[PDB]
Amino acid sequence: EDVYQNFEELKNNEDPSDYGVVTKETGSPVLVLAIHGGGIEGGTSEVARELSKEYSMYLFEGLKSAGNSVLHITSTHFDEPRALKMTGNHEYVISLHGYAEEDQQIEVGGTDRVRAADLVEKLQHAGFPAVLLNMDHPHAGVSPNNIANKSKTGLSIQIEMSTGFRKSLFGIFSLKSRAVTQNERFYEFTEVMFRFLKNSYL
Numbered sequence: 001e002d003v004y005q006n007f008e009e010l011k012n013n014e015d016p017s018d019y020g021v022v023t024k025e026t027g028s029p030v031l032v033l034a035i036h037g038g039g040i041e042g043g044t045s046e047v048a049r050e051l052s053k054e055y056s057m058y059l060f061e062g063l064k065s066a067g068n069s070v071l072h073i074t075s076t077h078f079d080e081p082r083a084l085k086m087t088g089n090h091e092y093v094i095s096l097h098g099y100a101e102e103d104q105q106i107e108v109g110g111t112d113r114v115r116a117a118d119l120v121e122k123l124q125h126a127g128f129p130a131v132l133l134n135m136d137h138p139h140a141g142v143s144p145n146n147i148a149n150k151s152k153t154g155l156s157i158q159i160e161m162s163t164g165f166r167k168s169l170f171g172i173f174s175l176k177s178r179a180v181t182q183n184e185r186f187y188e189f190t191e192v193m194f195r196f197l198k199n200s201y202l
């Protein structure tokens with residue numbers, strides 16, 4: 001259970017300096033969505049920001065020194081207005097998440113079954129620890145109420161990255177220092193993603 005039931009509630013209870021909404025609109029069909037950025041699911045801000053070099057981006061980040069877990073709103077409740085706008089303005093959505101787990105793993109779900117499977121094959125071929133989640137899996141992200149699915153098509157890819165995988169991409173795994181300690185494994189991962197996104201959406 002989240003602390004807040006929707007964005008309006010979070011906005012009314014939290015100081016505006018303790019979170020940040022960040023957008024980049026390029027007209028790309030694909031939107032990169034990271035609604036649990038900053039300290040909420042560490043590393044998702046950095047992956048989103050790197051992909052935003054080629055793709056439109058929506059980012060919601062928790063900016064507290066601690067206690068960012070209170071800022072987590074599950075995808076089916078996440079209704080921040082700038083996210084509703086940007087998702088509706090795009091054809092397809094890739095949404096980035098983190099979950100708790102020491103082993104390195106990436107779970108790939110979403111409503112776009114064909115492209116999710118293709119992504120998992122490309123990740124595995126490239127040497128990353130990706131599994132395809134199917135429709136009855138809990139991290140599947142297939143609800144129409146899921147922010148990632150409120151696009152022009154309803155087709156999403158949901159990328160859920162374990163703590164271990166996320167910690168592997170940074171010299172120093174802190175709010176302050178991830179963005180300035182991205183390592184060779186960070187760029188290798190984001191390269192596989194850029195390669196995939198350019199090919200899979202034409």
Ligand SMILES: OCc1ccccc1
Pocket residue numbers: 053054191194
């Ligand atoms: O310069 C960032 C970037 C890397 C890979 C592919 C596209 C863009």
